[PDB]
Structures are given as C-alpha cells and as structure tokens.
C-alpha cells in the first residue's frame, strides 16, 4: 500500500501498483522506497477521484466484456483536468 496526502491534509491509502498508474507518482516514489507522497496543490475532493480512476483503470484494462464510462461531474471537471495533467494520469 501507499499513502497519498491532499492539500487540506486527507490521507488516501491505495495499493502501490494502483498509484504507479501515475507516471509523476512513479517518479516521486522510484526516485529517493518511502510510503508517503504529499500534493500541496491537490484538494481531497480531487485526489479522492484521482484514486477512483486508479481503481477503474487497474480493473477494466484488458477487460473482454464491456467497459463503463468513467464519470466526471461538471463541478469537479476543471480541477480534475489540472490534477490529471500534473499526474501522468
């Protein structure tokens, strides 16, 4: 597991492999391994959803049946796009 910490200071414990979906996190962890990474400019309502994507990507990559749309509400769209860009994904 790995600990991602939002600006407001929420802690998110997610599987290491799930997190590594983010090239930028891969860099921060792979370059001195530690367990924590701190995002001073990403709020919780965003970093929460960024994790939810890791869950989604990990689960539905290489899925034979059918894949469901990864939903993004208008209210969060812009800040998520920012966060998404800053992280590789």
């Amino acid at each position: 597991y790995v600990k991602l910490i939002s600006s407001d200071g929420h802690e998110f414990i997610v599987k290491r492999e799930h997190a590594l979906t983010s090239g930028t996190i891969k860099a921060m962890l792979s370059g001195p391994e530690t367990n924590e990474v701190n995002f001073r400019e990403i709020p919780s309502h965003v970093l929460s959803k960024v994790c939810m994507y890791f869950t989604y990507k990990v689960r539905y990559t290489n899925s034979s049946t059918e894949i469901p749309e990864f939903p993004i509400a208008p209210e969060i769209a812009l800040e998520l796009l920012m966060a998404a860009n800053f992280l590789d994904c």
Binding site: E17, S30, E33, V58, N62
Partner: protein, 109 residues
C-alpha cells in the same frame, strides 16, 4: 562496471526466497509467440533476464541506470500481463526490490 553489472544481474537471478525456490526461473527465457500470443500483443517491449546479460556481454547498457530502466520494464511488463496476486506478479515486485538492494550494495561499498 561489467563485473558489477554481472554481479547485480547474477544476484537477482541466483536470489532464492525463504522457502528455497528461485524466483528468476520463469524470468530466465521468454515464451515463443507460437506458445503465448496474448503476452506479445499486450507487451510493447518483450525483454527477459538473458536478453539483459546478452546486452551486458555486448555491454549494450551504458550506465547502471540504463540496466535498471529495462529490469523495471520486464518486471512491470510481467505485472501488466499477469493477474494481481499471481505467483509471477509478486516475484517481479520482489525482483525489483532485490535489484534495487543489489545495485545499492555493489555500486557504493
């Protein structure tokens, strides 16, 4: 350097876990496409542990950071292809952790 590359790469291969079993036994030579076509379609850069010693015998690797970049690539190629919690998945997680401790002992001591 080539001797250290041989040490780092031979320590990761020779490495046995705490039940006596060698982990690299599957990572020694890749499967033929005829055998397993799904792996080749899924994996961009099929590389094994002989393909890396071959490079090292050719000294294709320049620094110890270029040898590491392609040991992480196969160990991550394995993770992508295999099921999470598979025998082969968690050993490529250990082979990355035994390569990162093997390079840290030889390159600075």
């Amino acid at each position: 350097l080539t001797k250290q590359m041989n040490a780092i790469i031979d320590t990761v291969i020779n490495y046995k876990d705490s039940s006596g079993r060698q982990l690299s036994e599957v990572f020694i030579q890749l499967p033929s496409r005829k055998e397993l076509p799904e792996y080749y379609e899924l994996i961009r850069k099929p590389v094994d542990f002989k393909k890396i010693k071959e490079r090292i015998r050719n000294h294709k690797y320049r620094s110890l950071g270029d040898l590491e970049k392609d040991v992480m690539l196969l160990c991550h190629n394995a993770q992508t292809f295999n099921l999470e919690g598979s025998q082969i998945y968690e050993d490529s997680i250990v082979l990355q952790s035994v390569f990162k401790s093997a390079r840290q002992k030889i390159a600075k001591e």
